Amino acid sequence: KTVVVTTILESPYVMMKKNHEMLEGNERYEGYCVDLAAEIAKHCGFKYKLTIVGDGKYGARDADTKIWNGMVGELVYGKADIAIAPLTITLVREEVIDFSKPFMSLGISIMIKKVSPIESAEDLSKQTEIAYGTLDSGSTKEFFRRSKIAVFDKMWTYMRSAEPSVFVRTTAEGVARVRKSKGKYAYLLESTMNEYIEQRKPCDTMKVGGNLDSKGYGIATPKGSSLGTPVNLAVLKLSEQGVLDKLKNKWWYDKGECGA
Amino acid sequence: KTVVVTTILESPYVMMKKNHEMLEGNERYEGYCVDLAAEIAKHCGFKYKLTIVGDGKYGARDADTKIWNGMVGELVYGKADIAIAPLTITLVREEVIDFSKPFMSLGISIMIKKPQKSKPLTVERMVSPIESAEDLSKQTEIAYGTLDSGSTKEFFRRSKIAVFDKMWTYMRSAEPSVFVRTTAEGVARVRKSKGKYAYLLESTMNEYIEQRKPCDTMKVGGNLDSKGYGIATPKGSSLGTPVNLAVLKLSEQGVLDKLKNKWWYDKGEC
Amino acid sequence: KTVVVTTILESPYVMMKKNHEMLEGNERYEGYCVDLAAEIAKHCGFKYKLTIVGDGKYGARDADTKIWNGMVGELVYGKADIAIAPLTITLVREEVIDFSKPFMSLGISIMIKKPQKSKPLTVERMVSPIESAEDLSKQTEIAYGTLDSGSTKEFFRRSKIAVFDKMWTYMRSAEPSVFVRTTAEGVARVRKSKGKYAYLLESTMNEYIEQRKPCDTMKVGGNLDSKGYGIATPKGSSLGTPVNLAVLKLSEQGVLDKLKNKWWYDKGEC
Amino acid sequence: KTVVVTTILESPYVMMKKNHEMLEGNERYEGYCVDLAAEIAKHCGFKYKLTIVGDGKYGARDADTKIWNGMVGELVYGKADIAIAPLTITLVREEVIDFSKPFMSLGISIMIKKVSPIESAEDLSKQTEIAYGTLDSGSTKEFFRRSKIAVFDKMWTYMRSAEPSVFVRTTAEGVARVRKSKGKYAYLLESTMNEYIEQRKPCDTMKVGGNLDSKGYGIATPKGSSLGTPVNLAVLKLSEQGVLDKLKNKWWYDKGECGA
């Protein structure tokens, strides 16, 4: 029985190679998550087929409709069997799907154009001269929406009431927007994605400040699935063997096409 | 029914209060884990009594006897119901007990006695004999060790990495023994060995000791790996899901990071 | 019964909200004084309706008619029951209305257009033509004025200090009139007067304007005197004691200090 | 009829005259408060006699005894008619006596012995290497005791549980204690007394940071007394005339027996 693996087009997590038009199956995808899925399948011992979620959303709830979209929706409604992807482990997600132990630590970070005038999140919030926004239908937006801290609350309130729309459909779109904003826009994204962008050409983006919070990426399975325990044990074994560190080094630092 | 919360004695997680002679119950102990347990109790309604393991070990399964000891050991055999303590999530432990999502990230770090400031126009520069784990492995004039019956020793024993395998080979055949019974024992050994002993311990305790007087220890290099502390729970228990959800709530609500900051960096003696 | 809260339109104390075209009631206005009124209502339980004076004046005695105008005027004759605004506690007002303890301290300050940073090794130094009120009085090239029907004008009118008497004598016989109807009008006059006009206003408004864009104004010299803003109340009203106790309680809590911080410096720039 | 004025021996508010042994009546006292009392009496038009309170306390409530001591106790129980003294206006005091409008602004300030490693009160609360305390039965101890802010709460908790006693009987005693502590003790007093001490000989003390809060000194009168309105109007007239500023300049800066 083949296992359907939902995943998102994210760099360096999943990429469609460079000449994928002549390739078929799992061979036309590459990245951190492809290698992670291969290792998970090898440890557990199942055949898998990589598929990209039709709509490029990580997962959220609609406007009072109680409908999950993205990979989380693909998992809840039985369309997918597992999700090897940069899926953040959150409260609202864990109540509907089973997350494994985190395989990558991360955090919310600010990326701007190339001493920074904002640095910390407080100075970014206080100064309205530079705009800041998050990915739409993601987990950082839901972090700010549910946040009760005064700085985070005020940042969220500014973000929701912004003219024009400060959110972005894709993190690539957000990176492009901060690139062509001439330093007038800031992007709130995961620290791993921020580092990957800042170590890639043409290196006009840099990360300021620290991490707003600490989270992790998990492998998600449908609630009450027989694969949850095996994939959790596989993640634990890979972490103890240093395979996750090797994969992160390979897809984040080994190539390094930037001057640093 | 009041369930028990087994826990190790470790600063800044659990420390006896100064006026604990006349105190009893969950007010004798203070630290990060005591109010972590308080927050867990607030989130999911139950009464809890803090306990300390008699043998004073985190937990490891003895070879040729297949018997778990320490916090994990007495959690497995039903003498405990939940273990809120700096317990590392490991594969061997996850097969006998249920773990929650990590509430604190950590890594294996190196502790050495802080060397004297080198002097040469007149600037004071920091010079150390060890800067990573590879130079620790290759060199032989400085001994190094870990905590017995802990996760660090088990990580070194089951390591196929060449440098870690070499370091474990040195550790196993060492005279006198380089392993210590308690973290405080390792810190005292480092402080008294005059730079001839390095202590391999978790990064959180390493930073906590570094920030406190007499601040004669320094942490060299980066973390050897990436792990986390989880709230342990007996296998097939009903507390696993509420504990997981409470950990997620505390993480997303800023309780965890503010607790870590006010137990680690607010009291910066040095 | 709903008690009405008369108030002047002054920033950062009271500002019309951006989406106040559709908003109605107490939600139309925002600022320091609306927060103060909310806290006062929280302390002593009452419903309050914010009201802006039609006259647009703080209040004074008109010439030869012995009639009060502005907030003080409409409070004396019963069109309002409490005044929560930057109203200055003065002797001439305390004889006709009841004042509470000052919720914010203030002084009379000098506002001039910020000069250009003088360039002479290659250091940039601030140079100003006026450094105190004495040199403002002795000099004649720069005009200066106050706000009409306000506390500053009455203070200069009834001053027996030689320098202040000289300044008042210049003010009374100035041509064209140096008195402005609104604080914003005086600030605009200073801004567009190319350094030929100086505005004498309360230190709080001076600092707030100095900290906000385009921030081309500067406050020269120290405060001319020491006064405070109180919450006004008609003589014999039963609200005097509860409002006084509320002011003292809010001062003790630090609510006043945090309101000042979040309405004066947190929102500032440049 | 004569009016009994209660006051405390405080510099530069009330001092014993240099040749007071041969002096009688109000002529043997001098300071800011003596001049203030003279001006208040001249404005209102009453005869007064300065009396120093037998117990050298400003006023507070005892341990669950509901008994007022010091000047506030002298006023509540009818032993005095008015109090021209550095009496801080507080909620607990205002409920039992009538305070006039403040005639002097002040605040809580930290004074130590002459790199400034203490700076603000936050670092004082964070570091226990240096000790700090307040005046016993004053208005600073009651401010810290009733404070709900975390920094002030922890400062008060440290101060109450101090071995040996950290509080001082008199402000002069606290000045001496910080003088002879060789920079190991800090004193929390009013900003006016702090300034007067810091510009006086031998100038070995200095004030750090800023004011912890904003308060004022008022003229206190028994509840429901015919003198409250006249003395309030007198204070307002003196402030509008600049007399209070002249008195503060004369007793704080005119002498100036230090190099500054």
Ligand SMILES: NS(=O)(=O)c1cc2c(cc1Cl)N[C@H]([C@H]1C[C@H]3C=C[C@@H]1C3)NS2(=O)=O
């Ligand atoms: N250095 S890293 O981001 O590639 C990284 C991050 C992490 C790893 C392993 C690696 Cl290599 N394992 C941990 C897991 C292992 C066991 C302890 C915590 C979880 C369960 N999660 S983690 O702390 O998110």
Ligand SMILES: NS(=O)(=O)c1cc2c(cc1Cl)N[C@H]([C@H]1C[C@H]3C=C[C@@H]1C3)NS2(=O)=O
């Ligand atoms: N900054 S820290 O070490 O105190 C820390 C570390 C971690 C926290 C929260 C904090 Cl405050 N929560 C995460 C958890 C939250 C959700 C995402 C990963 C796990 C599930 N684990 S963690 O990455 O080990």
Ligand SMILES: NS(=O)(=O)c1cc2c(cc1Cl)N[C@H]([C@H]1C[C@H]3C=C[C@@H]1C3)NS2(=O)=O
């Ligand atoms: N820092 S400030 O100007 O906003 C400010 C100023 C003042 C405050 C409170 C604040 Cl926050 N309260 C005092 C009052 C409290 C008690 C002591 C003096 C009066 C009665 N008046 S004040 O000295 O005019």
Ligand SMILES: NS(=O)(=O)c1cc2c(cc1Cl)N[C@H]([C@H]1C[C@H]3C=C[C@@H]1C3)NS2(=O)=O
């Ligand atoms: N500069 S000072 O400390 O001598 C000083 C301080 C103050 C003065 C007058 C002087 Cl001279 N008057 C005010 C009073 C006057 C009217 C306005 C506020 C009160 C009622 N109180 S104050 O703000 O506490």
Ligand SMILES: N[C@@H](CCC(=O)O)C(=O)O
């Ligand atoms: N990893 C995030 C992506 C969205 C974001 O960057 O906030 C998620 O799974 O929701």
Ligand SMILES: N[C@@H](CCC(=O)O)C(=O)O
């Ligand atoms: N926390 C570790 C023990 C500490 C250490 O080994 O340094 C464990 O769970 O075993």
Ligand SMILES: N[C@@H](CCC(=O)O)C(=O)O
């Ligand atoms: N607050 C002053 C008016 C402002 C001013 O005169 O500058 C008053 O009560 O009259």
Ligand SMILES: N[C@@H](CCC(=O)O)C(=O)O
């Ligand atoms: N001025 C204070 C006394 C000094 C102090 O408490 O610091 C009072 O009236 O209570």
